[PDB]
Design an enzyme around this catalytic site. Sequence first.
Site, PDB file in Angstrom:
ATOM      1  CB  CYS A  66      39.716  38.500  46.922  1.00  0.00           C
ATOM      2  SG  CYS A  66      40.434  36.914  47.352  1.00  0.00           S
ATOM      3  CG  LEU A  67      36.021  37.611  52.129  1.00  0.00           C
ATOM      4  CD1 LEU A  67      34.912  36.661  52.583  1.00  0.00           C
ATOM      5  CD2 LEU A  67      36.211  38.760  53.117  1.00  0.00           C
ATOM      6  N   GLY A  68      40.267  36.138  50.664  1.00  0.00           N
ATOM      7  CA  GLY A  68      41.474  35.357  50.856  1.00  0.00           C
ATOM      8  C   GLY A  68      42.736  36.074  50.421  1.00  0.00           C
ATOM      9  CG  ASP A 123      42.185  26.832  39.257  1.00  0.00           C
ATOM     10  OD1 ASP A 123      43.248  26.293  38.880  1.00  0.00           O
ATOM     11  OD2 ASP A 123      41.431  27.453  38.485  1.00  0.00           O
ATOM     12  CB  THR A 124      43.304  31.640  43.325  1.00  0.00           C
ATOM     13  OG1 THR A 124      43.535  31.190  44.665  1.00  0.00           O
ATOM     14  CG2 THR A 124      41.816  31.549  43.012  1.00  0.00           C
ATOM     15  NE  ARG A 139      43.017  26.205  33.955  1.00  0.00           N
ATOM     16  CZ  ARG A 139      43.108  26.421  35.265  1.00  0.00           C
ATOM     17  NH1 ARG A 139      42.614  27.534  35.803  1.00  0.00           N
ATOM     18  NH2 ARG A 139      43.519  25.438  36.064  1.00  0.00           N
TER      19      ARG A 139
HETATM   20  C1  HEM Z   1      46.092  35.100  43.324  1.00  0.00           C
HETATM   21  C2  HEM Z   1      44.997  34.868  44.243  1.00  0.00           C
HETATM   22  C3  HEM Z   1      43.645  35.257  44.147  1.00  0.00           C
HETATM   23  C4  HEM Z   1      42.987  36.050  43.209  1.00  0.00           C
HETATM   24  C5  HEM Z   1      43.573  36.808  42.015  1.00  0.00           C
HETATM   25  C6  HEM Z   1      41.582  36.139  43.643  1.00  0.00           C
HETATM   26  C7  HEM Z   1      40.575  36.879  43.019  1.00  0.00           C
HETATM   27  C8  HEM Z   1      39.252  37.084  43.457  1.00  0.00           C
HETATM   28  C9  HEM Z   1      38.243  37.903  42.758  1.00  0.00           C
HETATM   29  C10 HEM Z   1      38.397  38.660  41.437  1.00  0.00           C
HETATM   30  C11 HEM Z   1      37.095  37.850  43.486  1.00  0.00           C
HETATM   31  C12 HEM Z   1      35.776  38.566  43.123  1.00  0.00           C
HETATM   32  C13 HEM Z   1      34.820  37.692  42.306  1.00  0.00           C
HETATM   33  C14 HEM Z   1      33.614  38.449  41.745  1.00  0.00           C
HETATM   34  O1  HEM Z   1      33.525  39.685  41.908  1.00  0.00           O
HETATM   35  O2  HEM Z   1      32.754  37.801  41.118  1.00  0.00           O
HETATM   36  C15 HEM Z   1      37.387  36.973  44.636  1.00  0.00           C
HETATM   37  C16 HEM Z   1      36.438  36.585  45.610  1.00  0.00           C
HETATM   38  C17 HEM Z   1      36.610  35.641  46.622  1.00  0.00           C
HETATM   39  N1  HEM Z   1      37.808  34.982  46.837  1.00  0.00           N
HETATM   40 FE1  HEM Z   1      39.615  35.287  45.879  1.00  0.00          FE
HETATM   41  N2  HEM Z   1      41.381  35.441  44.818  1.00  0.00           N
HETATM   42  C18 HEM Z   1      42.619  34.896  45.137  1.00  0.00           C
HETATM   43  C19 HEM Z   1      42.812  34.042  46.199  1.00  0.00           C
HETATM   44  C20 HEM Z   1      41.822  33.525  47.017  1.00  0.00           C
HETATM   45  C21 HEM Z   1      42.045  32.451  47.981  1.00  0.00           C
HETATM   46  C22 HEM Z   1      43.365  31.751  48.297  1.00  0.00           C
HETATM   47  C23 HEM Z   1      40.844  32.208  48.596  1.00  0.00           C
HETATM   48  C24 HEM Z   1      40.684  31.508  49.786  1.00  0.00           C
HETATM   49  C25 HEM Z   1      40.152  30.172  49.890  1.00  0.00           C
HETATM   50  C26 HEM Z   1      39.863  33.092  47.954  1.00  0.00           C
HETATM   51  C27 HEM Z   1      38.510  33.210  48.367  1.00  0.00           C
HETATM   52  C28 HEM Z   1      37.568  34.124  47.899  1.00  0.00           C
HETATM   53  C29 HEM Z   1      36.212  34.306  48.425  1.00  0.00           C
HETATM   54  C30 HEM Z   1      35.620  33.651  49.665  1.00  0.00           C
HETATM   55  C31 HEM Z   1      35.609  35.210  47.610  1.00  0.00           C
HETATM   56  C32 HEM Z   1      34.150  35.615  47.688  1.00  0.00           C
HETATM   57  C33 HEM Z   1      33.890  36.947  48.374  1.00  0.00           C
HETATM   58  C34 HEM Z   1      32.503  37.501  48.093  1.00  0.00           C
HETATM   59  O3  HEM Z   1      31.891  37.135  47.069  1.00  0.00           O
HETATM   60  O4  HEM Z   1      32.034  38.338  48.884  1.00  0.00           O
HETATM   61  N3  HEM Z   1      40.473  33.905  46.993  1.00  0.00           N
HETATM   62  N4  HEM Z   1      38.719  36.514  44.601  1.00  0.00           N
HETATM   63  C1  LIG Z   2      38.797  33.342  41.815  1.00  0.00           C
HETATM   64  C2  LIG Z   2      37.408  32.907  42.298  1.00  0.00           C
HETATM   65  C3  LIG Z   2      37.506  32.253  43.685  1.00  0.00           C
HETATM   66  C4  LIG Z   2      36.461  34.060  42.305  1.00  0.00           C
HETATM   67  C5  LIG Z   2      36.387  34.432  40.818  1.00  0.00           C
HETATM   68  C6  LIG Z   2      36.520  33.069  40.085  1.00  0.00           C
HETATM   69  C7  LIG Z   2      36.618  32.116  41.295  1.00  0.00           C
HETATM   70  C8  LIG Z   2      37.236  30.807  40.847  1.00  0.00           C
HETATM   71  C9  LIG Z   2      35.219  31.899  41.826  1.00  0.00           C
HETATM   72  O1  LIG Z   2      34.323  31.200  41.545  1.00  0.00           O
HETATM   73  C10 LIG Z   2      35.130  33.256  42.605  1.00  0.00           C
END
Ligand code: HEM
Ligand SMILES: CC1(C)[C@H]2CC[C@]1(C)C(=O)C2
Length: 405
Positions: free
Chosen positions: A348-350, A242-243, A177
């Site tokens: 999403c892995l997290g 930031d999620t 942002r």
């Molecule tokens: C409310 C919580 C969360 C939301 C809504 C969210 C959402 C997402 C989304 C939409 C993507 C796909 C991005 C794309 O397709 O370009 C993603 C990927 C990813 N997220 Fe999350 N996320 C959340 C929490 C987290 C947390 C806590 C972590 C852990 C540190 C995390 C780590 C990752 C990673 C490693 C990927 C990359 C996976 C890949 O590209 O194969 N996320 N997330």
């Molecule tokens: C939520 C995320 C971790 C996923 C989509 C936006 C984000 C901040 C990244 O750069 C990857």
Amino acid sequence: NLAPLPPHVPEHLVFDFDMYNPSNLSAGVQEAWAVLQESNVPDLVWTRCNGGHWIATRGQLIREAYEDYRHFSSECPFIPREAGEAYDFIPTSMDPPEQRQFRALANQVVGMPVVDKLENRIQELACSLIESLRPQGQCNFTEDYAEPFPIRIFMLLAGLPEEDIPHLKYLTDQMTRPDGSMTFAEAKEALYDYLIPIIEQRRQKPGTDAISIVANGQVNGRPITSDEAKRMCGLLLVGGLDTVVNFLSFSMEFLAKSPEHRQELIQRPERIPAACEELLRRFSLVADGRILTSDYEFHGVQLKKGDQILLPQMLSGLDERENACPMHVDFSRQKVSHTTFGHGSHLCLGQHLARREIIVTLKEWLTRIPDFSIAPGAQIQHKSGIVSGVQALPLVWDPATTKAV
Ligand code: HEM
Ligand SMILES: CC1(C)[C@H]2CC[C@]1(C)C(=O)C2
Ligand SMILES: [K+]
């Protein structure tokens, strides 16, 4: 202002939406984005804002595009174009087949068995923070819980000092942002400047923390390079900082405004897992996209090679073609349909760590402070971006209604 219309874009498909400052923002950020799904607007539009790009507005088209990595590439995933060009995080900036090998390594630090490992500390920290706020009768929820709770858990996981949180949180927010003081490229480079010394340090002296495992890890056999480890660790920082932070605040803003939904979960704390999913559907918060590798006719529209398309994860679950009465929150919905955590190969892995932090927050907060409200007269403001958020959330309760457990 606006960017001039390209030759191939027909005039009846132009709808000038700004994803960083939508015109209906006061009504709520989900509501402001939901204006793309009214009767007058097509399934696929062109906006002249932010350099110019497409937006898919429907759940069908968003799912379709995220499955097709051949036509729709992750190489340039952020709008505006120059933010997407500078973006090189792993594994999010790669397509299959090469992204797949980095997923198994990232899963060692944020996946399910590490969640099980942390579960005791996640429990501990929630109860400690809430029991501290409880006698006070009031809090700015964003500052007092929503930020410290997820962030402190991540700094523990990654073995970084807590005094570093202000600097890191600021840089992360400029990527999602922006306020105009830093370009995406400058924010990213400053995050790397922080990490490089630390990744070098834990490659000569390995610990058990998250950064040590990534840096000394292996992708499909081969040792991971210092450069790749920097680009993976950069993403994990952004994701940890930031999620969940932003989603907790949307969820609690709703719960303070709806004493009936609050009551249902107090009466039946076993519905809290199900409630978590519906809240994730209704208060979805992420929007990025993809770049066209070739010219492609997608549902009767001509896309040209090089065009960016925003595929808002947010909109899939607010689409009334997927869920009936989509702006209404219902904890006993039969099929909760969303793409809040993504779709396709970049799921999403997290998400397991996210859901656990959400469910532990709801259970432990309602158990101690069952009755609370927004501070009276305060107007709650949202902010839009790659990840949307809440500026501030003043809550009030009366400490006589609370329970020390
Ligand atoms: C409310 C919580 C969360 C939301 C809504 C969210 C959402 C997402 C989304 C939409 C993507 C796909 C991005 C794309 O397709 O370009 C993603 C990927 C990813 N997220 Fe999350 N996320 C959340 C929490 C987290 C947390 C806590 C972590 C852990 C540190 C995390 C780590 C990752 C990673 C490693 C990927 C990359 C996976 C890949 O590209 O194969 N996320 N997330
Ligand atoms: C939520 C995320 C971790 C996923 C989509 C936006 C984000 C901040 C990244 O750069 C990857
Ligand atoms: K890139």
